[PDB]
Write a protein that binds this ligand. Structure first.
Ligand code: HEM
Ligand SMILES: CCOC(=O)CCCCCCn1ccnc1
Ligand SMILES: [Cl-]
Ligand SMILES: [Cl-]
Ligand SMILES: [Mg+2]
Ligand SMILES: [Mg+2]
Length: 431
């Protein structure tokens, strides 16, 4: 009740404290109710699974209008998630990378390279890979700085009472601007794009959408938007990713309408529904662990590489990805069959004591940090990892410089999702 800092700040936590493990009878990964439990309970549940049932089978959650279908084998240990990620010939990304079943209706919009194996996957990725390389992403530092600086200044100018929502006022709009400008989308449409991607990756949370007809209308609307922009760029090139997409050939053929729409959707969804959560979880963590804030603030450039990676490990913005077996395998005495679904729990790998001796410590100097927040490595390693790391670093530097004592004042409103570790709103203040 008499803590350092601003009076309405949330409670701090003792760094390093492991959450209690949860009795296995209380764990139901196949119920959306489990995904509504407190993150301490979730974290303690995956701790139980790592200890007691490191590979275990679960029914698939059926969100309204999706097809659940067959259940899945959950890999909760780091070493199994890594192995699966590095064996794509066994653990295929086709037909889907979420646990539910693909359909033709969905594949119009969600049939991108993320649900394909090589060689076609790599031929698609090579259309855009150069734009996401470290040395190319570095050359847009000025754009990231301009927008992040302006957003933080606007939080100050727009809120005389010194209260704001970090998500809507910084964490959301920064990555949105950057990916949309890369794509070649005009500013006037960025908020439309953001509403569409919020629904696409928020489905099942009543605050976002629970009517499948709304999900499909949004998907059709963003697909139509992509097609129309692509059509413009076919006739008049711009130096943007949409133009690259429409100019490319794979195996001697231009991409179809479905392929262009799916590629465009993949890139904007992934740009808009990930980094914002790393930033927001990171501010939550700094609020809980002020010693970590202080050490980063007093050596920002020196600690930034490791600090950003620790924020990603801590947040695990992508909770899991799915694979499908192409052959029978056995792991940990559990035999899994060709055709079975396998879920890779990055959130759990990133707390595995076998790989991190002190996994419950939020340590901005952590080195090494072999976290799987961008996946286990290999063919599908996050295309956006360099971009995301730069966005995160700049956002925190701009906060440090202009409102160093920014702190959460309420616990987050958490997205109801099995797939994305999302924060919908995070009230903050500053002096
Ligand atoms: C902190 C932010 C992010 C996290 C934690 C994240 C995480 C991931 C993960 C876990 C995967 C799957 C990797 C695998 O299967 O091995 C992935 C793939 C991907 N990510 Fe990200 N991502 C982030 C930001 C971004 C950004 C900014 C973009 C830019 C558009 C992006 C685009 C993609 C794409 C296109 C793929 C599919 C790559 C492929 O199939 O080859 N992501 N990401
Ligand atoms: C299911 C509907 O959305 C999609 O299929 C398209 C987006 C998939 C993105 C996967 C998650 N992610 C975010 C950032 N990097 C990876
Ligand atoms: Cl533990
Ligand atoms: Cl600490
Ligand atoms: Mg407000
Ligand atoms: Mg532009």
């Amino acid at each position: 009740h008499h803590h350092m800092g601003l009076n309405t700040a949330i409670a701090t936590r003792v760094n390093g404290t492991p959450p209690p493990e949860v009795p296995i009878a209380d764990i139901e990964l196949g119920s959306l109710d489990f995904w509504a439990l407190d993150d301490d309970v979730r974290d303690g549940a995956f701790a139980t699974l790592r200890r007691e049932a490191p590979i275990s089978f679960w029914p698939t959650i059926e969100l309204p209008g999706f097809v659940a279908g067959n259940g899945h084998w959950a890999l909760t240990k780091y070493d199994d998630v890594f192995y699966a990620s590095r064996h794509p010939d066994i653990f295929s990304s086709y037909p889907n990378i979420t646990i539910n079943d693909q359909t033709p209706e969905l594949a119009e919009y969600f049939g991108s390279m993320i649900v394909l194996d090589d060689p076609r996957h790599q031929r698609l990725r090579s259309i855009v890979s150069r734009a996401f390389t470290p040395k190319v992403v570095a050359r847009i530092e000025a754009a990231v700085r301009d927008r992040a600086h302006r957003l933080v200044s606007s939080m100050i100018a727009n809120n005389p009472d010194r209260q704001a929502d970090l998500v809507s006022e910084l964490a959301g709009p920064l990555p949105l601007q950057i990916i949309c400008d890369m794509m070649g989308i005009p500013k006037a449409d960025h908020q439309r794009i953001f509403h569409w991607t919020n629904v696409i990756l928020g489905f099942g949370d009543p605050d976002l959408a629970t009517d499948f007809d709304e999900f499909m209308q949004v998907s059709a609307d963003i697909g139509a938007y992509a097609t129309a922009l692509a059509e413009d760029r076919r006739v008049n090139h711009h130096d943007d990713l949409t133009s690259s997409l429409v100019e490319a050939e794979v195996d001697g053929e231009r991409l179809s309408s479905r392929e262009i729409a799916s590629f465009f959707i993949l890139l904007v969804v992934a740009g808009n529904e990930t980094t914002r959560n790393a930033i927001t979880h990171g501010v939550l963590a700094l609020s809980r662990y002020p010693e970590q804030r202080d050490r980063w603030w007093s050596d920002f450039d020196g600690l930034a590489p490791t600090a950003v990676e620790e924020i990603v490990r801590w947040a695990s913005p992508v909770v899991y990805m799915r694979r499908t077996l192409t052959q029978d395998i056995e792991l940990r005495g559990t035999k899994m069959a060709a055709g079975d679904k396998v879920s890779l729990w990055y959130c759990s790998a990133n707390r595995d004591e076998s790989k991190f001796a002190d996994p419950w410590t939020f340590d901005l100097a952590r080195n090494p940090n072999p976290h799987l927040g961008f996946g286990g490595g290999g063919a599908h390693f996050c295309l956006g990892a360099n971009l995301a790391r730069r966005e995160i670093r700049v956002a925190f530097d701009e906060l440090r410089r202009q409102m160093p004592d920014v702190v959460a004042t309420e616990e987050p409103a958490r997205l109801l999702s099995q797939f994305i570790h999302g924060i919908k709103t995070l009230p903050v203040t500053w002096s």
